[PDB]
Design an enzyme around this catalytic site. Structure first.
Site, PDB file in Angstrom:
ATOM      1  N   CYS A   1       7.104   9.802  -2.218  1.00 33.58           N
ATOM      2  CA  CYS A   1       5.800   9.992  -1.590  1.00 33.58           C
ATOM      3  C   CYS A   1       5.852   9.618  -0.111  1.00 33.58           C
ATOM      4  CB  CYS A   1       4.738   9.187  -2.340  1.00 33.58           C
ATOM      5  SG  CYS A   1       4.464   9.826  -4.029  1.00 33.58           S
TER       6      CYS A   1
ATOM      7  N   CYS B   1       6.291   5.263  -3.123  1.00 29.85           N
ATOM      8  CA  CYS B   1       7.711   5.184  -3.465  1.00 29.85           C
ATOM      9  C   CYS B   1       8.450   5.959  -2.372  1.00 29.85           C
ATOM     10  CB  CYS B   1       7.969   5.831  -4.825  1.00 29.85           C
ATOM     11  SG  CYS B   1       7.870   7.634  -4.833  1.00 29.85           S
TER      12      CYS B   1
ATOM     13  N   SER C   1       1.136   1.233  -2.821  1.00 25.36           N
ATOM     14  CA  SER C   1       2.196   1.455  -1.832  1.00 25.36           C
ATOM     15  C   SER C   1       3.177   2.523  -2.352  1.00 25.36           C
ATOM     16  CB  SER C   1       2.917   0.130  -1.550  1.00 25.36           C
ATOM     17  OG  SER C   1       3.673   0.194  -0.354  1.00 25.36           O
TER      18      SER C   1
ATOM     19  N   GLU D   1       0.023  10.438  -4.933  1.00 20.74           N
ATOM     20  CA  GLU D   1       0.132  11.011  -3.593  1.00 20.74           C
ATOM     21  C   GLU D   1       0.502  12.496  -3.581  1.00 20.74           C
ATOM     22  OE1 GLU D   1       1.868   6.767  -3.377  1.00 20.74           O
ATOM     23  OE2 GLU D   1       1.284   8.278  -4.873  1.00 20.74           O
TER      24      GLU D   1
HETATM   25 ZN   LIG Z   1       5.554   8.214  -5.378  1.00 22.30          ZN
HETATM   26 ZN   LIG Z   2       3.563   5.840  -6.329  1.00 19.54          ZN
END
Ligand SMILES: [Zn+2]
Ligand SMILES: [Zn+2]
Ligand SMILES: [Zn+2]
Ligand SMILES: [Zn+2]
EC number: 3.5.4.1
Lengths: 152, 152
Positions: free
Chosen positions: B88, B85, B83, B58
């Site tokens: 991001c 973290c 998905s 990302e």
């Molecule tokens: Zn991340």
């Molecule tokens: Zn990630």
């Protein structure tokens, strides 16, 4: 309490001043091991220096520390001259950095400062005059560049 | 905006596959303008390719889009094969990117997925099998490398 706070903030401010000299956003920081006080890395915002949309002071600092095993972050303190936006707050949380010492939160502040504490992180605001002085000047002279840095 | 979702994930997956071919973590993405479906940028994790501690799929995607005026992100969609973290997630929140379309949240997920919704963003999990297969293959082969990416 931490005996390394004076060292940590002086370094972070040093980075912010350098960034300002280079013509970028005056936000700096460093990551320090709480047990011995060693500097894992330091850095400043590189939006203008590298035409980067992700290198905020905190992110640049973490990038400068290099690839590290997750456990290394667990007992460190991230020093930043300005209260972190949602992205830098996320970086701290993702890596598990337990403590964040903030130069000031007068010129800027996001939901991240409180979110950090809600997620179990210790936040310390020193209210450093130097930091407040340089950041306020940048905001006053280049407001448009400042807003670009916070997505506004 | 939803009309570009097949294109967006296709590119995100192509980036992941490419990154995998480069010997890195198979996580890719791209940012698309909801208005015309034009691709502002695309990227993949660069931890191994560049020894980077912040270039997650990302973050790399946003970096590759270059500096942009805050208003540009307000009507874009960020596609990620996995998905996000907390870091991001924080980047999406800071820039005000309205939509985040996710390939899968089976191999990984953080509190960020929901925090995005709490903060007013739209989250869509497509459960793409191509994404799940390549990511599970990576985790199976190089578990330690994976854990490092999420600071564990
Ligand atoms: Zn991340
Ligand atoms: Zn990630
Ligand atoms: Zn900041
Ligand atoms: Zn930030």
């Amino acid at each position: 309490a931490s005996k390394w706070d004076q060292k940590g903030m002086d370094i972070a401010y040093e980075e912010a001043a350098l960034g300002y000299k280079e013509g970028g956003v005056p936000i700096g920081g460093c990551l320090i091991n709480n047990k011995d006080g060693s500097v894992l890395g330091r850095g400043h915002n590189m939006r203008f220096q590298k035409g980067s949309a992700t290198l905020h002071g905190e992110i640049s600092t973490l990038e400068n520390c290099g690839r590290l095993e997750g456990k290394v972050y667990k007992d460190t303190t991230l020093y930043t001259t300005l209260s972190p936006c949602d992205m830098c707050t996320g970086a701290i949380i993702m890596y598990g950095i337990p403590r964040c010492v903030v130069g000031e939160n007068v010129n800027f502040k996001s939901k991240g400062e409180k979110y950090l504490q809600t997620r179990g992180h210790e936040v310390v605001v020193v209210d450093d005059e130097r930091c407040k002085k340089i950041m306020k000047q940048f905001i006053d002279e280049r407001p448009q560049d400042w807003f670009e840095d916070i997505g506004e």
